[PDB]
Structure 1
């Protein structure tokens, strides 16, 4: 949903961008309006591709781009940036310091913040399971292949 993907500030910024394209203010983006801003940016496209880049996001097929369609375009652009990198943030939650390894103390820190509590001994049980190298720290490579700590 747009509320999940976009914040109030981003919606305001997109509206200003939409108004930059819509010099008329009627609420729709025509080919000439889209072509004008492209020339200001240096590009000189033809109407054949200019229509194509409108039809690619025009939902109702009226031939013009309104704000609901403009927001829907930007909502997809924000969403599809992250595809499978969600494990990177999950790794950094356990990795407080910022290096490439998860320490037992760092695993204690996240477990302390979470509801479940450890008796300072079973923390070694799952870290040695995740850490195959046996160095006492779980790196990023060990975390993605199998997640226990």
Structure 2
């Protein structure tokens, strides 16, 4: 395990843990879902948590969240990734730009930095054209 992954696990938790008390409630889950365009019922939020709430205390802590992140995509991800490509590629020209990546991050809550947006583009960019095409994206998401 890299310090890099730890980094990523912290970001991922902090998408849900909006108050940063260190636990994910149904309310925080529901909030994240709604921003993703879904409207889960209260029962559904309970169910999502209770699949992974090892101590049965009705919330999710860091290691229980790690379990969430560790369960595979693993047979229906191709379509989920095709869909994801569409949301990222707003003008649909088949290439994700820095500016389109920035919007996604924002919509996910991040509002810094530009260099880091470029960095993200740079790392996903196999052919060197400065943007992310569908295949480059596929690999950025299966990394």
Relative to structure 1, the CA distance from residue 148 to residue 106 in structure 2 (aligned partners, 3 Å threshold; closer, same or farther) is farther
Q: State the structure with more CA Rg.
A: 1
Aligned-partner SS, 2:109: coil
- Gapped runs of 5+ residues in structure 2? none
Relative to structure 1, the CA distance from residue 99 to residue 7 in structure 2 (aligned partners, 3 Å threshold; closer, same or farther) is farther
Question: Is the contact made by 1:127 and 1:148 (CA closer than 8 Å) also made in structure 2?
Answer: no
Question: Is the contact made by 1:129 and 1:148 (CA closer than 8 Å) also made in structure 2?
Answer: no
TM-score using structure 1 length: 0.47
1:31 shift after superposition = 0.4
Aligned positions of 1:1-149 closer than 5 A: 6-77=1-72
1:132 shift after superposition = 38
Relative to structure 1, the CA distance from residue 142 to residue 41 in structure 2 (aligned partners, 3 Å threshold; closer, same or farther) is closer
Relative to structure 1, the CA distance from residue 133 to residue 65 in structure 2 (aligned partners, 3 Å threshold; closer, same or farther) is closer
How much is the aligned-residue C-alpha RMSD, in angstroms? 15.1
Question: Is the contact made by 1:130 and 1:148 (CA closer than 8 Å) also made in structure 2?
Answer: no
- Gapped runs of 5+ residues in structure 1? 1-5
Equivalenced residue count is 143
Deviations along 1:19-71, one digit per CA (max 9) or x if unpaired, are 12111110000000000000000000100111001100111000000111111
Question: Greater share of strand residues, 1 or 2?
Answer: 1
Question: Is the contact made by 2:15 and 2:108 (CA closer than 8 Å) also made in structure 1?
Answer: no
